[PDB]
Amino acid sequence: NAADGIFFPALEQNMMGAVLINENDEVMFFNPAAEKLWGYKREEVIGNNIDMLIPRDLRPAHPEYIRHNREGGKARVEGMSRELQLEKKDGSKIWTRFALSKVSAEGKVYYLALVRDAS
Amino acid sequence: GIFFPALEQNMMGAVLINENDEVMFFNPAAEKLWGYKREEVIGNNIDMLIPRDLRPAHPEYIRHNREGGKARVEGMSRELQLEKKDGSKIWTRFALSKVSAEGKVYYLALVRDAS
Numbered sequence: 001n002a003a004d005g006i007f008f009p010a011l012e013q014n015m016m017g018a019v020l021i022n023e024n025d026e027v028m029f030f031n032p033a034a035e036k037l038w039g040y041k042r043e044e045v046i047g048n049n050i051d052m053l054i055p056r057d058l059r060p061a062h063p064e065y066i067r068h069n070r071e072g073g074k075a076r077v078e079g080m081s082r083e084l085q086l087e088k089k090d091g092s093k094i095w096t097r098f099a100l101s102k103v104s105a106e107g108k109v110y111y112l113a114l115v116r117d118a119s
Numbered sequence: 120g121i122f123f124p125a126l127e128q129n130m131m132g133a134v135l136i137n138e139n140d141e142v143m144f145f146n147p148a149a150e151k152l153w154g155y156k157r158e159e160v161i162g163n164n165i166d167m168l169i170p171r172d173l174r175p176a177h178p179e180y181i182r183h184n185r186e187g188g189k190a191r192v193e194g195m196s197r198e199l200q201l202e203k204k205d206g207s208k209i210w211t212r213f214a215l216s217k218v219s220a221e222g223k224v225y226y227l228a229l230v231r232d233a234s
């Protein structure tokens with residue numbers, strides 16, 4: 001259905017990680033590039049909340065960042081690009097470069113974060 | 120699906136090309152970076168999006184990557200000078216990726232402003 005097209009294999013085989021979340025903050029997408037950055041397999045991330053991929057010191061503040069952007073609207077205005085400290089499964093930390101993007105589809109709101117290594 | 124709307128409404132520009140270096144996709148983020156509308160770019164060759172001083176050399180670099188077979192693209196790692204329609208120049212950052220789709224080879228260049 002989607003794998004037979006061109007847009008799914010673009011994000012799936014991208015050099016950058018790709019973490020899509022639906023309106024309920026559930027990770028519906030997690031390509032192999034994001035598996036190497038976070039150290040998580042696809043089975044451990046899909047279906048679960050977004051806060052598992054957030055560092056533990058940033059867990060208190062992150063649910064309030066997402067909630068505010070959902071109530072805002074702003075005639076749709078993607079987001080931003082900056083460097084953030086990613087926390088892996090094993091507890092180690094690497095610096096990265098995120099590129100967050102709001103994406104409306106079928107009256108709902110999603111978020112795709114394109115990540116790469118910045119060390 | 121949610122995959123077309125994701126790249127269409129991405130803050131980063133998105134320039135997909137097919138086997139014959141023809142631009143199949145050009146989202147509104149890439150419209151602002153290059154000064155070209157998507158109507159002007161779709162169907163035509165990649166040549167226009169390449170700077171004029173790099174026009175002759177660039178087609179050989181793409182052809183060499185196709186014959187190699189390698190999955191990961193190691194080129195275009197550091198900052199590069201994009202050339203707009205009007206002739207002015209801005210600095211950017213490219214994240215190039217080989218995409219095996221539809222039994223052919225593609226290339227998606229995700230771009231941003233690194234000014």
Ligand code: HEM
Pocket residue numbers: 019020021050053054055058062065066068069079082084085086087100111112113
């Ligand atoms: C390495 C893991 C991540 C870290 C450390 C992180 C960090 C942050 C920080 C610090 C902010 C506050 C805005 C700012 O930076 O000034 C933020 C905002 C936000 N994040 Fe993340 N983030 C991570 C992953 C993600 C992912 C995967 C998503 C969803 C795909 C996401 C969705 C959002 C959203 C929707 C906002 C609100 C944007 C705004 O209005 O400022 N985050 N994040």
Ligand code: HEM
Pocket residue numbers: 134135136165168169170173177180181183184192193194195196199200201202215226227228
């Ligand atoms: C701003 C416009 C662009 C500039 C200035 C540019 C510049 C360059 C340069 C100088 C090289 C050779 C040096 C190197 O690999 O580091 C190169 C390689 C390459 N470029 Fe571009 N490029 C541009 C746009 C694109 C686009 C839109 C695509 C396709 C989506 C593309 C695909 C490739 C490929 C496949 C290679 C070969 C890399 C390798 O052999 O690993 N380029 N580019």
